[PDB]
Design a protein around this ligand. Structure first.
Ligand SMILES: Nc1ccc(NC(=O)OCCCCO)cc1
Ligand SMILES: Nc1ccc(NC(=O)OCCCCO)cc1
Lengths: 438, 438
């Protein structure tokens, strides 16, 4: 019911609307809908209106750019010149960026118009989006449920239909989990495929961090593919998959360290069944699948060190630099195991998370949180296992809508493909989405 | 005089010769010429001839592979199943690799036939190729002079016309310097563009590389372009440079912490002056060129930490993991400085090294060494400055033949271009070559 980013760019080139009109309608949707959601927490409406006029001048001057005049937002952690980058920290609430980030620079060169920035948790360290500077973002499908983490403001903006395109970052599921919670499309990209420059920790110039990636978020896979081509360091190989027949799928509905809803399991099997009916082959086990239990142990270990920048708590000896090199070897080994698995399979079908969006939690300690799995208690932090494979291995993982649970909360599919095949992930997701309409 | 890898592939495809004949012709050239050179130190001739026969069964099957039946060698540090990978250590002379390295695997899938492996220094830690397992590689242009360091076997084997194609590695100039010492082509690739898998330290699986890149070595720029497209993780963007008119070049012939000799300065200026004659704009300074003295200091500090795998002497403190992360931020700061410089410039023209191939030295400590620069003595290790920019900044850098000094020792130009523009570096070098002809 809302214009996609590509449709918007065509509507401005095609003449039925101007870049200023596209920007004032987006502002109008933001103001008419954000009240109960609280997604667009930084607003730059006057500078955006001037950018739209400049875009219409380019449109008048016969200039055509793939995203020309398209209004959009970006996650609050990405630097935009003249805007605050806080990461949810009150200490950093007044840190104003003096230059655009690389991803914003690429999208602005494609002609995009940035209206503001979307909400995040403190330090981008939660699966919900709430912080002292901006407040809390509420899921648009259920205001009592969380809207996902770090990219949750982005996903709630797309789900509420305010803007057609968004961009997030993902060190522990922050593109896929919000897209899952809010039923939108999110692409965790191949590690090192998109520059993090400008995704700086506030008041620093440190943006590069292992396991972490930045990726597009939208409501259509065509929007993800185009935003990825605009933002990637180099053009990534386009997908040659025309249809689903012959596709080899490994379907994972179980994990050795966590669990999934029965609604989540049925949804993921229905996606595999719909592709099976479209000529794909679906396996449910493989001798080549790496040890998912050892994976999440290595992953959490490396994740803790990266977030602590090596510093060690409570007088513990810090991990040595020599041991950090061995951990990178452990990761590299694990990536080779996934290359062998991806010789037999084109994609992994698995949950994004074990359950749908949980009710708002004021508890910062994940060990003190809990989840309800079919009316039973499950550990909160153990759910990181579904996220760990694509993050630790570097593989791209797509989170795409599959439907909703009995309570009307969205359930998304995760599609994991081999490294550097991001366009295959998008292409397969589009075909799955069509196969479910059958 | 000798055929190139592309030319060789065409002759086999056309049927001017079979793959077995091209293989036997290469074996004969090695047996006739390697005697005084000692470049092809690991020989796999019998397995290569069976592989050549298999390639002919595929020419008869009309299979299309861009390197089918093309004989070549690889640097000894790359793994080949069944062949030793010692890195010049006597203790590792019997370490037999159990699987092909990735780069070997890619070239073989393109149809290349591997005759063997070329000589290296102990631990790849010098600008000459000499080790207890295999002996020393002598420069083909002057047997009293070193053949380049760590790829000297590769460069010398191409300079002697034994094989059309090779492949090296580079952390401190080891593609560029051997190519300069022997007057062949060598592409130092953008960091993280080609996989180091199989370039393992003997008896380990540790590619372990920061600042370390693998890239092809050949006698023609088109051979490098083909080898780069076969081996890169992802197809790199092709060059759009049709000619030299409009090319912005920044020529450096001085460096705040090192020196070059006059014959070397004269060749680099001759390449720029010939690009000027073809329509390129040349500058000899820029407000955007970062501090090369700070660069070489930080590069040396990172190089040593990387080579020591984080270990420190018993009297010194090890660099902490947190300090290592800050050093990676320092590198990212330097790379962004080169981004801005490359907004004003398409390429940098500079020396590969200050001097041509020096006489064989048996002194392992670089601090106890020194070079002769136009009759004057100069410290040996300071010459790491010319190499440091592309390795620290990660940029691609090509080393291409320009001429020779008064003793007939070749001189190469280093062409540095912005990150991910490896094909632009190849393309400019090819253009410079055709400008220095007509
Ligand atoms: N254990 C844990 C789980 C989820 C997150 N959220 C996240 O994915 O961060 C994305 C921001 C990229 C740079 O941090 C963090 C930690
Ligand atoms: N300090 C210093 C250390 C090493 C070299 N050798 C070199 O040129 O690169 C080595 C290529 C191996 C890549 O794994 C020179 C100086």
């Amino acid at each position: 019911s809302e214009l996609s980013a590509i449709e918007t760019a065509a509507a401005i080139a095609g003449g039925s609307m101007t870049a200023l009109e596209a920007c004032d309608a987006a502002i109008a949707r933001i103001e008419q809908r954000d009240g109960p959601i609280n997604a667009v927490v930084v607003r730059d409406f006057d500078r955006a209106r001037d950018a739209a006029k400049a875009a219409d001048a380019e449109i008048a001057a016969a200039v055509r750019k793939p995203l020309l005049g398209v209004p959009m937002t970006i996650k609050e952690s990405f630097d935009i010149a003249g805007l605050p980058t806080s990461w949810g920290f009150a200490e950093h609430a007044d840190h104003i960026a003096t230059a655009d980030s690389l991803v914003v620079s690429r999208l602005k060169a494609a002609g995009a118009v940035f209206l503001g920035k979307s909400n995040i948790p403190v330090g981008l360290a939660d699966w919900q989006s709430v912080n002292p500077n901006y407040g809390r973002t509420n899921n648009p499908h259920d205001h009592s449920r969380s809207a996902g983490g770090s990219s949750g403001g982005a996903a709630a903006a797309l789900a509420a239909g305010m803007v057609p395109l968004e961009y997030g970052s993902d060190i522990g599921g922050s593109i896929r989990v919000p897209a899952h919670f809010c039923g939108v499309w999110g692409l965790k990209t191949t590690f090192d495929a998109v520059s993090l420059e400008g995704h700086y920790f506030p008041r620093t110039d440190s943006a590069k961090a292992d396991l972490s990636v930045v990726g597009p978020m939208a409501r259509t896979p065509a929007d993800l593919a185009l935003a990825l081509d605009i933002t990637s360091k180099v053009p990534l190989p386009q997908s040659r998959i025309a249809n689903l027949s012959g596709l080899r799928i490994l379907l994972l509905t179980a994990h050795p360290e966590t669990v999934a809803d029965s609604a989540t399991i049925s949804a993921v099997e229905r996606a595999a069944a719909a592709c099976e009916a479209s000529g794909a082959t679906v396996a449910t086990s493989s001798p080549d699948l790496p040890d998912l239990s050892a994976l999440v142990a290595d992953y959490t270990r490396m994740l803790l060190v990266v977030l602590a920048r090596g510093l060690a708590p409570e007088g513990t000896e810090p991990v040595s630099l020599n041991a950090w090199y061995a951990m990178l070897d452990d990761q590299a080994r694990m990536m080779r195991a996934f290359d062998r698995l991806f010789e037999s399979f084109d994609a992994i079908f698995c949950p994004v998370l074990g359950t749908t969006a949980f009710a708002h939690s004021d508890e910062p300690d994940w060990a003190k949180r809990s989840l309800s799995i079919d009316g039973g208690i499950a550990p909160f932090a153990a759910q990181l296992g579904w996220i760990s494979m694509a993050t630790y291995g570097g593989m791209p993982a797509l989170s795409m809508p599959l439907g909703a649970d009995g309570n009307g909360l969205p359930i998304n599919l995760q599609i994991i493909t081999r490294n550097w095949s991001d366009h295959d992930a998008i292409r397969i997701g589009a075909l799955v989405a069509e196969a479910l309409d059958r």
